[PDB]
Each structure stands twice: as structure tokens, then as C-alpha cells.
Design a protein around this nucleic acid. Structure first.
Ligand SMILES: [Mg+2]
Ligand SMILES: [Mg+2]
Ligand SMILES: [Mg+2]
Ligand SMILES: [Mg+2]
Ligand SMILES: [Mg+2]
Ligand SMILES: [Mg+2]
Ligand SMILES: [Mg+2]
Ligand SMILES: [Mg+2]
Ligand SMILES: [Mg+2]
Ligand SMILES: [Mg+2]
Ligand SMILES: [Mg+2]
Ligand SMILES: [Mg+2]
Ligand SMILES: [Mg+2]
Ligand SMILES: [Mg+2]
Lengths: 159, 213, 176, 293
RNA sequence: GAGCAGAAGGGCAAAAGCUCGCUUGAUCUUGAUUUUCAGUACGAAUACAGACCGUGAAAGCGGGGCCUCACGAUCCUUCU
RNA sequence: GUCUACGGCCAUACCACCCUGAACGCGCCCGAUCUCGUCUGAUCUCGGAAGCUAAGCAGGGUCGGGCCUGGUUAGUACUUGGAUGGGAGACCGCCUGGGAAUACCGGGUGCUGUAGGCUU
């Protein structure tokens, strides 16, 4: 049996990366968090106040509550039988915007851009993304020179 | 006495050195690792022959010293006492334990079964891989039929299956034999004792001026 | 001559500190009356210095009172430093110098130069340690945008002689 | 063969540098984390800070707010822009710090449209004057002081700019404890000897204190006050005229310039082909150098 | 590579270390949340809010200890 | 071409020594009456402007060290899933997918935002 301490097994997840210690870069303190956006919870060990628990490091939730220093996040936590939605308070040094939603919020605006300009050009442009159909036919030029004959090599003992 | 090597032959118990967490181990028996004429520089011993294993096992310090001595004695009465240079390229860092010895009778003391059976240390072994040398002897080129013979006799002191193999490298270096005598001529390789310095052409140029004068 | 003078505006060897010290082994009258000599050979108030960690091999313990020290600067510091070289007969040896171009020397009897034996003043000795500087070393101990003082601007051991044999013409050799 | 060198190769392999403006000795990131960072439940509100810096020949005063790409200057005053009125010489003191902070206030608020309200206090009275909000009107420009690495001690020139800003109409939370009028031991604020410093009467009494001591040392000290024929008198009114030209025209105009060259005052970086044959003829004039004997 | 009361790990350099100055936010309160978890409690902890203060020029920081441990229901007694 | 004030990314920016820096500016610097701090006007604070780029700083340099990015190491080590595959075992081949790291060898060496200067 192992102890139920708050930071057991956080020897490496809460440690700072190599030559990236000391002072926290100050643009992380001025990223703005409006409620309802998707954030990723990492959690650094330099700031001891407001850090999340080790079951939330690497997880992802949305904001429901913004305060002076911290933020309130709804994170799905998979306990044994059921996934329940926890509500945790985490200071903003321990979070960062997720680029997975950013890559989607800019193509909603881009699918809606092409669709409202598809009428004066009279085109039916493709909006859905298709999962890599197989390659069409093509001709492989030899360009003059023969394909080089490869061959298995004998066995040497060197190491 | 101690247990036979049938009991601690296989690598199964998670490398366990003597450290801040393992104290009072008995001293390893193999103390001398380099042997022969240790001051021969470069051109005196051009040949290099090895002793590679073919098993993933663990060799013991009792077996490493015993095979060092028999490989020493044949090379003494083959080319004089300082015509060779062997160097066992293993170190017994993994530590062997042994469970306690029940004597009398079940009351004294504290235990009478497998209760409390994390054993105390009694030995040091060295784990080997497949591609890995064990012994290496450097001699003249006219002693090839004796480095093979001295290492063939040292095979009989180890549990596993070993192979004898003359290397392509000059001595105990990492550079090939055919290229060596011309790389010394073009000042890329500079000898100092048993090894050799590699001098690359990207340092400061004052290092070049002292060397190439 | 065209290369001889380019140092004439800003490269002039000049003294910064003077660094008095009188070290005793006894807190009490052996140190306060040893602090009594420094208000007249300089004119300032000397500040005390305490022990750091005990040794017990010769009987002092930590946070006792061990020594007094005083740092003399400016136009004052030359006429005390003239009262130490003439006591040493303008003779000090090569090992008194440092790698950074600083010298120090000791005095066996403080009434040499020297005021006048008092009715309750000690027969103590002391030592002067000169920190020899240059117009521009004070960028290493400021607060806003400090930095190192350079490489050719630094004081060397051999060119501290080039200040000493010309301003005060004292002599060396015996070196060892 | 003397010391084990501490700056070996393994020293630099795991040497972590500090931030750039920390190892340049310019900023303090401990105090920048607390002075700049807006609370998250205001979500976009700019947190303005008054940056005052004292060089050896010039006073720099400016208001900035921060974003992720750098600080945004909204306005900036200087001391070298004072001789376009009134005073001619005698900068980087407590008086010219006041007029710089006076200029930094009034140039800011007319850009926003607020020149005709929040005039601060047009008469110089060195008592605590905080700007309150005139209701039924737009609010007062709340700002904070960025002192930097200068030490906050009683009588610093960074508070001449703070007193000039708060008398120019800016709302700044402050206290009389760090002002030249403050008395330390009695917990007393004189408020009149402070007025001797906003006008420059400590300098003018000193100009009359070294007329009796020396004659050639006085004209070496204030060798630029003898220029413009600035007597030790008329200085109270010398700065009073400056305060009128601030509130009259604080709008900054600059002189453009495009008839310039593009001339290199440096040496361009040496390319790869030049660097490689250089060490070839370093070796060419070495092998052929020592072949004479 | 020192120090930070202690075990060990993590964190930390115009700092969390050291030395000084000024002080009780180790105060009074209602909830929400996290950790163990049955998503019960205790213990500990995190964000707030309402007071009342402390500190600093100010931004701010503080409702015990740089973070991870240092402790206890009903009944009963006692005090406010 | 660039510099101050403020920054963002925190070494392509650091470190060692060398060479140059026109004008601005930053500095060194000159003092200690007031302001305010000391054992000491050296730091801190303040009032100044005789003197210089000597230093800081900026730019370049170095068959530089680091750091960054490539190769090579190497389809190697390791590995997902598979077999009534091998072998006495230790362990090793094959099938189906993914796939590193050092030595060694190249190249690179700060970008950049707001605001205000000089550069004819
Ligand atoms: Mg366990
Ligand atoms: Mg445990
Ligand atoms: Mg682990
Ligand atoms: Mg706490
Ligand atoms: Mg086991
Ligand atoms: Mg039992
Ligand atoms: Mg501060
Ligand atoms: Mg502090
Ligand atoms: Mg509150
Ligand atoms: Mg308060
Ligand atoms: Mg109780
Ligand atoms: Mg009761
Ligand atoms: Mg290099
Ligand atoms: Mg495979």
C-alpha cells in the first residue's frame, strides 16, 4: 500500500524542464480567459499556490468561472465505473489555451466564408474533410537509367 | 562456502548496485582489471583479439578473476612476461542476495519460514549482453595463434557460450587497422599511452600550429 | 609619443580604498581601546566586525567581537598611506601584491606613524590593504545596469608597480 | 595545474541564462509581475502604469500598458523637449521632473478629450491633492507609478514626476511619506519646503550659498547657468512661466526627416566563403612561413 | 554545487536564502470546490465573497509556516 | 544603416579575449549646500557638465567553447499485435505496424512590438 499524499509520484510531472527554471515568463500571466473556452491543464511546480491534482495534469476541460487570479474548469475525470465532471479551481500559471479548438474555430469561419462566396462564382466547393483516399494512377519515369539492383549483404561480426 | 553459479546465472532481479540504499556488501574478488605490460604505447601491440559472449546472463566476480588468471598464465609462457596486455572489460556492479540460514529451531529468531525474506547481500555479478566483449588482449601480429588459444582456455571458466574474435581495430582503439598507420601520418591521430587522441579539424587554430610544427 | 599618450583622459592609476584592520582575540577592553586608536589616525568612527563560526582551538566562539576595520577614501586616504610606506622605509616585497593589483602591508607597533601614546591606549599593531582602482571601476557595484569592468581596463600585478614606483618611488627586490 | 576550473565545458552545458532585460540590468521581473498583470475577471481592461526613468542628462516619463507582444506606449514626455518654452538649461533635477510630469499629464488627457475638465490644481500648493471623479463627466485616468530599479527614498526625483502628474489632473494613489516636504522623525509633512523644490529654490539658494564661498568654483559648477544670464534670482518665476506654456499647448509636434543616407556605420557580417579561405591562407602563410630556416 | 526547523522529493538568486524596518491575515464570517472517496465524514488544501486590519510611495501581497505529513465522532464536562 | 525608454520570445541572445565605433543618446565623470543614506557622498540620494570612448554598451572578428538546427548513428536499439516458429533453457529469428539516443560530420548564431532621436 502507498500513501494517499497529494503529491506522490509527482517527482517529474511537477518539476521544471531543463534550463527552463527560475522566473515564469510573464506573457503567461496576461493570456485572457473568457468563460466557455477549452484549456489544457499542465501545472508547473514553481507556483505552489492553486496547482491542480496529479489526476488533472495533462487533462482538458472548459472554463465555467473566472476570478482575479485563478479560473474554474469543468474537467471530465474517469473514476472506475463512471466519468463524472469535476469542477476544479486552478491558477492561470497551470493552464494554457488548447490549439485543438483554435484549429477548429478558424475553419468554422472559413467554411462559412467559402459557402457565402460559392454563389457568385457558382461553384459547389468541398467543405467536409475526407480521410485520405488512395492514390490515383501515375507513370513512373525511368528517365533513361536502369533501376539499381539491390542485394542482401553477407554477415560480418564487428560488434 | 557459497552457492553454485546455477542459482545466480539468469538476469531477473533489476540492477542493484551498492549505493546509499545497499550497504555492507562483501568486496568483489576481481580487483586487478588491467594486466600485462600496461605502458605499451601504440606500435608495440598492433593486434587486438576479443572474447564476446552469446547469452544474456550474468558472470560472477569469482569467475572473472579465475578466468583472468588462467588467461594470464598461458600468455606468460608464450611470449615472455611483458609481450601481452589483457584488460577484462567487465565490472561486477550488480549485487547478489541470499536468504537467511535457518538453524535452530523455529523460535529464535523472529521468523521460521518465508516471513521477512528480503535477503542480505553476499556477492557481486556482472550482467552481459549478446554483442559485448569480455576480455581483450593486445599483442604483436605474430602472436595471433596464442591470443586465440589463451582465450579458448578462459572460456572454460564461464557458464555461457563465448566466441573468440580478432578485431579490425588497431589495439584497444576504435579506429581500423588498415587506416591507422596513415591517420597517424596525416596527424589526425596522436598517440598518448595505451590509447590515442583524435584531433579533429574544427578547434582553434593555435592547437593546429603547435601540432603541425 | 603619438602612441604614448592616449591614456591621459581616463586611464590613471588611483587609489579607491585603504581598509584599516586591527584584529584581537578578546572582546572587551582589548577591542574598545583598540577601537579607540582609529578616531584620531583617521578621524572617522570605526565599525566593529564579529566572528562567523567558532574554532575552539585557541578559545574564541562565534558572535563574539574579534576585530575593527575602517575604509578610508578620497583625499584623506593618501596622507594615511604615506604614514605606512615611510614606516616600511619605502620597502615591501613582491608577495605583498595580488593577482588583481592590490597591495597590503603590516605594522608591528601603531605609534610609529602614529600619534602619541595615551594613558590607556594599547601597544597594538595593524595593517593597511590598498584597493587600487581606475576611473571607471564603479560600474561593477551600482544598481541600474551593472557589469564587468573589462579585460584590458583591469589592474594587473606588474602594472601596479607602474603606479607605485612613480607616485611614491618605493622599491622591491627582495622578491621572495 | 592549480584549480579545478569552475567554468569548464560542463558549466556552460547546463548554464541557464536569465531573461534578457534582467541580465542587461534594466528590469525587475519580481516587481513587474505585480505592477503590470491585470486581474482576469476584467478580461481586457488596460492596466496603465506611469514609467519614470532618470538618466544622467534627461528625464523620461511615459504611460504604458502591456500586451503579449510588448508594452503599448499611449503617451511619452521627455526633458529635452523643455526648451521649446521658458526654461533653457538646468534639466534632470526635481524641478524639471515636475514639469515633465506636468507635461505628461496634460498631453495625455487632451488626446482623450479631457482638457477642459480635471485641470488638477493650477496653483502650486505642495499638500496632498488627489483627483476625485467629477460625476456626470467621464472618469479620471487612474494610473500607477513604475519606479523601476531606483530606490524609493524620501525626496526622489521620481516623485517630482508623480507630483507633476497628480497636479496635472491624473488620478494616482499615493502618499506624502515619500515627498521632499516629509519629516521622518516627527511623522510630519511640512508642505511648504516641498514648494521650494517644485520651483527650484533649493538650487537658487545654493547659487547664493556659493557666491560667498568661492568665485571661480561657482562659475565652474553652474557654467551653463552663466550662459543665458540666469541669475540666482528670478528662478521661481522662471518655472512659473513654464507651467503656463504647458497648459496652453501640450500637444506634441515632431520634425520629420527623409533626406538621409543609408550609409553603413558598422561592418557587415563575414560570410561563409570569406571565413573558410581566411583560415586556408592563415595556414598558407605558416607552412610557407617556417620553410626558410 | 549554500540556505529554506525536520524525512525525502519538487521549487527558489535585485528570490522562497540572509540581514534589517514596520506589524498580527495564526482575526471575524456564510457558502462553493479539490484531495481520501461510496464521490460520506474527519484531517488537510484551493479559489471567492462580506467585514475589519497589517504592510508598502504604489501596484499589490497576507485570512499561519515555499509545496507534499504533523491528528480525532456521538454522549458528557467546561468556557465564550 | 541605427540608438535610447519600455517590452515580448528567454543563449542563434551566453562565455573567453581581440578590433572598430561619425552624429545623437546611454554612460564614465565633477561635486556634497539642500534632499537623503552610510565606518567611508564608493554604492544609494542630490546639484551639476570640465573631460574622454579607456570601460560599460553597440557592431564585427575566432579553422573558439557552449547553445540551436541538420545529417550520421540507423530502419540499429527498443516495441504493438501474431504463430501447434526455433531452442533443454537463456533467449533468438520471422510476420504485421511504429521507430529512438551519444560519439562522428555540416550549417547557423538573436529576432521583434509600441513611443521618441540622430544619420543631408
Ligand atoms: Mg507500494
Ligand atoms: Mg510507500
Ligand atoms: Mg516513475
Ligand atoms: Mg500556503
Ligand atoms: Mg525477482
Ligand atoms: Mg512464522
Ligand atoms: Mg521594488
Ligand atoms: Mg524582496
Ligand atoms: Mg476579504
Ligand atoms: Mg491596504
Ligand atoms: Mg472534540
Ligand atoms: Mg451538553
Ligand atoms: Mg563553433
Ligand atoms: Mg519489426
Amino acid at each position: 500500500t502507498n500513501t494517499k499524499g497529494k503529491r506522490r509520484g509527482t517527482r517529474y510531472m511537477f518539476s521544471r524542464p531543463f534550463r527552463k527554471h527560475g522566473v515564469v515568463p510573464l506573457a503567461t500571466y496576461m493570456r485572457i480567459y473568457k468563460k466557455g473556452d477549452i484549456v489544457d491543464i499542465k501545472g508547473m511546480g514553481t507556483v505552489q499556490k492553486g496547482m491542480p491534482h496529479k489526476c488533472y495534469h495533462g487533462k482538458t476541460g472548459r472554463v465555467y468561472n473566472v476570478t482575479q487570479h485563478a479560473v474554474g474548469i469543468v474537467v471530465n475525470k474517469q473514476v472506475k465505473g463512471k466519468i463524472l465532471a469535476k469542477r476544479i479551481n486552478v491558477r492561470i500559471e497551470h493552464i494554457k489555451h488548447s490549439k485543438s479548438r483554435d484549429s477548429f474555430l478558424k475553419r468554422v469561419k472559413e467554411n462559412d466564408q467559402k459557402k457565402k462566396e460559392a454563389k457568385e462564382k457558382g461553384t459547389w466547393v468541398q467543405l467536409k474533410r475526407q480521410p485520405a483516399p488512395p492514390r490515383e494512377a501515375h507513370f513512373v519515369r525511368t528517365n533513361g537509367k536502369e533501376p539499381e539492383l539491390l542485394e542482401p549483404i553477407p554477415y560480418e561480426f564487428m560488434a | 562456502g557459497r552457492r553454485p553459479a546455477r542459482c545466480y546465472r539468469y538476469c531477473k532481479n533489476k540492477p542493484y548496485p551498492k549505493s546509499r540504499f545497499c550497504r555492507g556488501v562483501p568486496d568483489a574478488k576481481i580487483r586487478i582489471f588491467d594486466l600485462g605490460r600496461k605502458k605499451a604505447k601504440v606500435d608495440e601491440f598492433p593486434l587486438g583479439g576479443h572474447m564476446v559472449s552469446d547469452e544474456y546472463e550474468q558472470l560472477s566476480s569469482e569467475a572473472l578473476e579465475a578466468a583472468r588468471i588462467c588467461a594470464n598464465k598461458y600468455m606468460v609462457k608464450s611470449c615472455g612476461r611483458d609481450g601481452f596486455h589483457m584488460r577484462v572489460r567487465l565490472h561486477p556492479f550488480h549485487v547478489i542476495r541470499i536468504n537467511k540460514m535457518l538453524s535452530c529451531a523455529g523460535a529464535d529468531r523472529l521468523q521460521t519460514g518465508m516471513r521477512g525474506a528480503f535477503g542480505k547481500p553476499q556477492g557481486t555479478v556482472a550482467r552481459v549482453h549478446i554483442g559485448q566483449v569480455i576480455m581483450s588482449i593486445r599483442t604483436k601480429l605474430q602472436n595471433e595463434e596464442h591470443v586465440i588459444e589463451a582465450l579458448r582456455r578462459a572460456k572454460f571458466k564461464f557458464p555461457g557460450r563465448q566466441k573468440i574474435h580478432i578485431s579490425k581495430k588497431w589495439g584497444f582503439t576504435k579506429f581500423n587497422a588498415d587506416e591507422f598507420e596513415d591517420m597517424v601520418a596525416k596527424k589526425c591521430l596522436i598517440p598518448d599511452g595505451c590509447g590515442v587522441k583524435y584531433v579533429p579539424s574544427h578547434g582553434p587554430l593555435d592547437k593546429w600550429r603547435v601540432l603541425h610544427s | 609619443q603619438d602612441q604614448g599618450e592616449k591614456e591621459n583622459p581616463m586611464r590613471e592609476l588611483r587609489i579607491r580604498k585603504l581598509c584599516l584592520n586591527i584584529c584581537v582575540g578578546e572582546s572587551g577592553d582589548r577591542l574598545t581601546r583598540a577601537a579607540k586608536v582609529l578616531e584620531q589616525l583617521t578621524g572617522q568612527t570605526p565599525v566593529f566586525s564579529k566572528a562567523r563560526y567558532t574554532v575552539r582551538s585557541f578559545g574564541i566562539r562565534r558572535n563574539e567581537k574579534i576585530a575593527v576595520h575602517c575604509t578610508v577614501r578620497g583625499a584623506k586616504a593618501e596622507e594615511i598611506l604615506e604614514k605606512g610606506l615611510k614606516v616600511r622605509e619605502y620597502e615591501l616585497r613582491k608577495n605583498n601584491f595580488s593577482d588583481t593589483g592590490n597591495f597590503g602591508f603590516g605594522i608591528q607597533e601603531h605609534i610609529d606613524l602614529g600619534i602619541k601614546y595615551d594613558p590607556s591606549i594599547g601597544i597594538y599593531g595593524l595593517d593597511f590593504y590598498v584597493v587600487l582602482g581606475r576611473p571607471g571601476f564603479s560600474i561593477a557595484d551600482k544598481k541600474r545596469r551593472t557589469g564587468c569592468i573589462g579585460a584590458k581596463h583591469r589592474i594587473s600585478k606588474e602594472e601596479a608597480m607602474r603606479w607605485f614606483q612613480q607616485k611614491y618611488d618605493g622599491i622591491i627586490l627582495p622578491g621572495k | 595545474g592549480f584549480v579545478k576550473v569552475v567554468k569548464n565545458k560542463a558549466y556552460f552545458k547546463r548554464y541557464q541564462v536569465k531573461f534578457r532585460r534582467r541580465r542587461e540590468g534594466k528590469t525587475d521581473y519580481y516587481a513587474r509581475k505585480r505592477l503590470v498583470i491585470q486581474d482576469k475577471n476584467k478580461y481586457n481592461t488596460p492596466k496603465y502604469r506611469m514609467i519614470v526613468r532618470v538618466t544622467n542628462r534627461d528625464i523620461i516619463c511615459q504611460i504604458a500598458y502591456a500586451r503579449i507582444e510588448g508594452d503599448m506606449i499611449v503617451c511619452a514626455a521627455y526633458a529635452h523637449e523643455l526648451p521649446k518654452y521658458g526654461v533653457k538649461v538646468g534639466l534632470t533635477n526635481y524641478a524639471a521632473a515636475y514639469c515633465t510630469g506636468l507635461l505628461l499629464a496634460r498631453r495625455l488627457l487632451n488626446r482623450f478629450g479631457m482638457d477642459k475638465i480635471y485641470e488638477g490644481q493650477v496653483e502650486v500648493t505642495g499638500d496632498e491633492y488627489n483627483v476625485e471623479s467629477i460625476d456626470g463627466q467621464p472618469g479620471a485616468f487612474t494610473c500607477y507609478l513604475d519606479a523601476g530599479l531606483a530606490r524609493t527614498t524620501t525626496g526622489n526625483k521620481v516623485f517630482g514626476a508623480l507630483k507633476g502628474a497628480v497636479d496635472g489632473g491624473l488620478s494616482i494613489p499615493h502618499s506624502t511619506k515619500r515627498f521632499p516636504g516629509y519629516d521622518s522623525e516627527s511623522k510630519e509633512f511640512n508642505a511648504e519646503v516641498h514648494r521650494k523644490h517644485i520651483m527650484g529654490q533649493n538650487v537658487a539658494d545654493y547659487m547664493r550659498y556659493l557666491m560667498e564661498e568661492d568665485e571661480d568654483a561657482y562659475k565652474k559648477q553652474f557654467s551653463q547657468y552663466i550662459k543665458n544670464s540666469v541669475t540666482p534670482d528670478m528662478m521661481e518665476e522662471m518655472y512659473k512661466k513654464a507651467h503656463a506654456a504647458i497648459r496652453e499647448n501640450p500637444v506634441y509636434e515632431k520634425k520629420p526627416k527623409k533626406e538621409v543616407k543609408k550609409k553603413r556605420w558598422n561592418r557587415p557580417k563575414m560570410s561563409l566563403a570569406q571565413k573558410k579561405d581566411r583560415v586556408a591562407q592563415k595556414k598558407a602563410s605558416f607552412l610557407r612561413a617556417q620553410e626558410r630556416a
